[PDB]
UniProtKB/Swiss-Prot annotation, chains A, B:
It comes from the Eukaryota. Residues 2-57 form the SH3 domain. Expressed to high levels, and with a high degree of kinase activity, in certain fully differentiated cells such as neurons, platelets and macrophages. Isoform 1 is widely expressed. Isoform 2 is expressed only in the muscle. The phosphorylated form is termed pp60c-src. S-nitrosylation is important for activation of its kinase activity. It comes from Gallus gallus (Chicken). It is found in: Cell membrane; Mitochondrion inner membrane; Endosome membrane; Nucleus. Signal peptide: none annotated. This is Proto-oncogene tyrosine-protein kinase Src. Forms a complex with polyoma virus middle T antigen. Interacts with AFAP-110. Interacts with GJA1 and PXN. Belongs to the protein kinase superfamily. Tyr protein kinase family. SRC subfamily. Non-receptor protein tyrosine kinase which is activated following engagement of many different classes of cellular receptors including immune response receptors, integrins and other adhesion receptors, receptor protein tyrosine kinases, G protein-coupled receptors as well as cytokine receptors. Participates in signaling pathways that control a diverse spectrum of biological activities including gene transcription, immune response, cell adhesion, cell cycle progression, apoptosis, migration, and transformation.
Length: 57, 57
């Protein structure tokens, strides 16, 4: 349930978490699901998506 | 490899993808890994993290 940061990470947006190597992090249960980088074949746009919003096909 | 959007989603940041129900989406292989919502026990801050940057403990 608990994880440790392996590397420093600096936030790029208002929503990501900055952290230093060694921090202890706990995953937050979330209705959105894991986020994935996705490319829309329909529109050609690309960006992160909430995985609970999609299904295989 | 291909997914279908089950719901409309409007972008909240510069990095997420907006899409409409029915779009076909392809996952992009990514060095960052899936993103997770996490709470730092070390700093008390909370936000999304790249899962490849951490390890269980």
């Amino acid at each position: 349930m608990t994880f440790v940061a392996l590397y420093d990470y600096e936030s790029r947006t208002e929503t990501d978490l900055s952290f230093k190597k060694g921090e202890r992090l706990q995953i937050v249960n979330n209705t959105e699901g894991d986020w994935w980088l996705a490319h829309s074949l329909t529109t050609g746009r690309t960006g992160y998506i909430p995985s609970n919003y999609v299904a295989p096909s």
